[PDB]
Amino acid sequence: SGRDYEDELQSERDYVAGLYARLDAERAQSQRRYAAALREHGGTAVERDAEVRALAKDIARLNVADNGLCFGRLDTLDDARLYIGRLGIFDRDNDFEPLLLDWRAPMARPFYVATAANPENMRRRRQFHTLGRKVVDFTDEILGRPTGAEHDATNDAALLAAVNAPRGEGMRDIVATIQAEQDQVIRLDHTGVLVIEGGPGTGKTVVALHRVAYLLYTYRKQMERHGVLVVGPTPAFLDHIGRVLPSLGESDAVFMTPGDFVPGLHVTAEDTPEAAEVKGSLKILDVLKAAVADRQELPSEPIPIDLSDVTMRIDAETAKWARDEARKTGLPHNEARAEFVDVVTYVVTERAVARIGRGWLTRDDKHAWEKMRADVVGELEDHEQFNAALDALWPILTPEDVLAQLYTSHERLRAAGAPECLWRADGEAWTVSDVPLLDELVDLLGRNKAADEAAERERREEEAYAAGVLDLMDNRELSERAAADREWTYGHVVVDEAQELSEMDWRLLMRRCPRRSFTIVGDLAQRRSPAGARSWGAMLDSYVPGRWVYKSLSVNYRTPAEIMAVAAAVLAEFAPDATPPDSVRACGVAPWARQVTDDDIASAIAEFVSEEAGREGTSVVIGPPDVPGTVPPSETKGLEFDAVLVVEPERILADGPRGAAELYVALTRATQRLGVLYRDALPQALAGLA
C-alpha cells in the first residue's frame, strides 16, 4: 500500500472510465438505431427483421461485456501498450488504433500463453481485479528477472529479486533456472493428466494456475462449455484461488472441497484413521454392492397372497428365483425392482391360472389362457397385500438409507462384509469419507420410474390448486448449472494438495472428467490424511496407466533457507527417503524459540499479535484448539503467510500417526519469520531453531 501504486491505479482507472464512456456511446447509438428500425424502416419485412435482430444482438453483446470490460494490459519490449478486454474497441478517427483488444484476437494471445522464460515479445503482463465497472486493484508480472519493484499481490517478484547465492562452480543465473522450470511446466504440450510435485515455497499453485490458463486458451473450443473443477482442501484455499485465478475467457470455474462433492451436502467431520483407510480404498466397492444386495430380502415364512378365488402364496423358492433373475438383469437396484416384480407376478399368475383352469383349460388354449392370465395380472396389480409383500422383499432405496442401516446395525455390517470399525451410533452423521460412498450409491441404486411419474403428476395437481385454476387442468451461469448436477462432466480438473485424496475421491473426480484432463498438484511428504496417496502411480494407474506426465520444481525461493534448515531436519526424521527442496534465499531474521511458561503463553501470543499489527503483510498463529487464538496446522495446509507463531511443537507433533507431517507443514508455512514456543523441551529436533 503506497501512493505510487495508488497513482498508477488511478491512471488505469481513468483509462477504463474512458473505455466505458465509449461503450455507453456505442450502446446509445445502437439503441437509437434499433428504435428507428422498428418505427420507420422502409424496406421489406425481412430486411427490417434482419436489421432489428442485428441491432438487438449488438445491444446484448454490449450488455454482456459491461461487467469486467477490461482484463489487463500487455507492455511490449518496444513499450507498446495493449489492453485486453471482453470487446475490441477502435478509433475510427485514427485508422482503428485498438483502445481495447478482444481477448480472442491473435494480438491478445500473449496475455494467456506468455511466460517469463519464453516471452512473446512482451515485457510485462498486468492483470486487473475488478468489480462491476471499477478496478479494485491490479497486479504485475514481469517476464524476466524482476527487480522487486512492481506490486504483484503474490510477492514472487520481490522474493525472486531477493535471491542470494554465489555464482557457483559452474556459473548459474539461478533465477533463470526457476523461470525455465516454471515455463517448461506451463508450456507443456501434454493435455492429458499432469502431475506437478515440488517442495514447499516453490510457488507450485501459481504455476499450476498459469498452466490451466494456457490450456484453457489453447483448447478453448474443446473446454469452454465444460468449465473447470477446482478442488481444494479448505474453503479459505478456494478463496485464495478465487483471488489469484487468471483469466479464463468466457469459461467458468466451480470450486469444491472434497466434502462438497455431493450436491446439496456439506461435510467437515473426519473419521478415525482406520475407518478413513477402509472407506477410502476401492475395496469398499465390494462392501457397498454387498450392502445393496443384502436389502433384497427373502420371506422368513411363506406370504399368503389370498387371491379372491385361489388363495395363492409367494414362497422362498419363488422369491429366491425372482431375485436371482433381477440381479442377473444387471440394472440398478431401483431399476431391477421392476424385473423382480414382473418375475414374481408371472410365476404367481401362471400358478393361479393353472389352478383356475383345472381340468377344462390347458396352455394349448392359447387365447383363453392368455386372456385368463391378463385377468389375473390385472387383479394382482391392484392387490394391496401382494404389492406390500413385494415392497417388503425389494424396497426402493436411497443412499442415506443404505449407509444408515449399514452403519447402525452389526448384522447388516457383517452381511456386507465390513469390519467393526465402521459401526457408529448415528447413521446419518456424515463424515468426509462418506461423501464418495453416497455419490457411488446414486449410481448403484438409480431411480424408480413409476414413483417419479406419480410424484410429478401429484406435484402438478397441487400446483394447479395453488394457482387457483384446478378445475381447468434457465439462463444460469456455467458454474451454477455445473455445481447443481452430479452428472456434469468438466473439461479440466485442478487438484492442489492432491496427496490427501483417497482412491474413492480419485474415482469420483475421474467419473466427473471423462476427457481425462487433469492438473494434479501436491507434495507427498506433506500428506496428513490417512487414506492419502503414498505414490502418484498407485492412484493414477487405474485410470491412465502410462499416459500421465510427471514434472517437479526442486528450487525453493519463497520461504527462507534458515527455517528450511529446521524443516529439512524434521523431514529427515519423519521421512528418511525425502529430499528437501533447494533453498536459494536466506532471510534477514532467523527463526526463534522460547520455553514459554504455562501462564505466559497467552502473553506471548498476544505479543506476537500486537507486533504483527504494525508490520506489513499477513501472519498467523498455529496451535492446538485447546490454546486460545490458534488454528490447527491442517487449517493452513495450502496457504502461505509472512509470519507464523507455532505453539507446542512437542504436542501437535503427537496427535495421530501423522503429526510430524503436520508440524512440517506448520513450520514451513512462513515466508518471512517463524517463532515457536514449547513447554517441556525441544522434541529431539529444532536444535537449529533458537
Side-chain angles (χ1 to χ4, degrees), residues 111-397:
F111 191 75
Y112 294 92
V113 310
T115 58
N118 203 341
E120 307 291 329
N121 190 40
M122 291 295 148
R123 180 166 53 78
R124 159 170 65 186
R125 172 171 61 222
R126 174 184 310 208
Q127 294 184 359
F128 299 136
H129 293 57
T130 51
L131 181 53
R133 292 195 165 194
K134 64 162 181 263
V135 170
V136 293
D137 71 43
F138 78 87
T139 61
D140 303 298
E141 293 179 353
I142 297 89
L143 277 46
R145 291 193 295 275
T147 57
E150 294 285 23
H151 293 276
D152 59 4
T154 181
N155 288 319
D156 289 297
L159 300 163
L160 289 167
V163 68
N164 63 7
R167 308 307 193 192
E169 300 168 36
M171 191 255 298
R172 292 187 197 180
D173 189 358
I174 285 287
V175 177
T177 293
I178 288 172
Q179 307 298 284
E181 293 179 353
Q182 295 189 357
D183 185 74
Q184 197 164 20
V185 162
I186 292 157
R187 297 286 284 243
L188 170 64
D189 62 318
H190 177 69
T191 186
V193 177
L194 169 66
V195 173
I196 303 167
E197 175 166 43
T202 188
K204 68 189 192 295
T205 305
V206 180
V207 177
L209 295 181
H210 284 189
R211 171 57 175 173
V212 168
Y214 170 92
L215 282 180
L216 294 174
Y217 178 84
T218 303
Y219 304 96
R220 60 192 176 280
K221 194 201 309 203
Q222 281 74 251
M223 281 186 238
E224 68 190 321
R225 314 301 331 190
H226 291 57
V228 178
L229 178 68
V230 179
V231 183
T234 76
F237 179 93
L238 298 169
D239 300 327
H240 178 55
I241 301 298
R243 186 177 65 246
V244 296
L245 183 65
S247 178
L248 261 52
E250 302 314 309
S251 192
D252 215 328
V254 175
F255 301 97
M256 293 194 191
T257 59
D260 295 18
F261 286 153
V262 163
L265 178 72
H266 195 277
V267 187
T268 298
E270 293 179 353
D271 290 328
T272 70
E274 191 178 35
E277 198 85 50
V278 288
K279 286 183 190 169
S281 182
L282 296 191
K283 281 175 285 193
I284 200 70
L285 294 167
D286 295 308
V287 168
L288 288 186
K289 282 175 182 279
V292 172
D294 188 63
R295 302 302 293 259
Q296 303 157 2
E297 308 293 355
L298 282 193
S300 59
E301 302 306 329
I303 307 173
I305 295 310
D306 201 68
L307 287 186
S308 54
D309 47 7
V310 287
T311 189
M312 289 272 90
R313 64 171 61 121
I314 57 182
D315 49 11
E317 294 294 328
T318 302
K320 184 171 170 68
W321 180 78
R323 186 182 74 167
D324 293 18
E325 294 303 337
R327 286 169 175 188
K328 285 172 185 182
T329 301
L331 295 166
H333 173 97
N334 296 330
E335 284 269 25
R337 188 183 185 281
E339 193 82 358
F340 174 73
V341 170
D342 289 331
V343 178
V344 180
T345 304
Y346 180 80
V347 168
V348 171
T349 303
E350 292 285 26
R351 290 176 184 214
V353 303
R355 180 163 287 215
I356 292 298
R358 186 180 295 276
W360 71 269
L361 181 71
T362 66
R363 265 191 169 84
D364 68 354
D365 308 322
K366 275 95 182 189
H367 190 271
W369 191 274
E370 85 186 52
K371 306 307 286 198
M372 186 90 101
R373 188 167 61 214
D375 188 358
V376 172
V377 167
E379 192 216 10
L380 278 172
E381 281 177 351
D382 290 326
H383 202 299
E384 191 266 0
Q385 186 162 310
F386 177 71
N387 296 331
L390 292 191
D391 199 50
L393 282 71
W394 195 303
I396 296 91
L397 295 172

Side-chain angles (χ1 to χ4, degrees), residues 1-9 138 151 616:
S1 180
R3 204 182 190 287
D4 185 4
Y5 178 77
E6 297 299 313
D7 191 39
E8 185 62 18
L9 167 77
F138 78 87
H151 293 276
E616 177 61 296

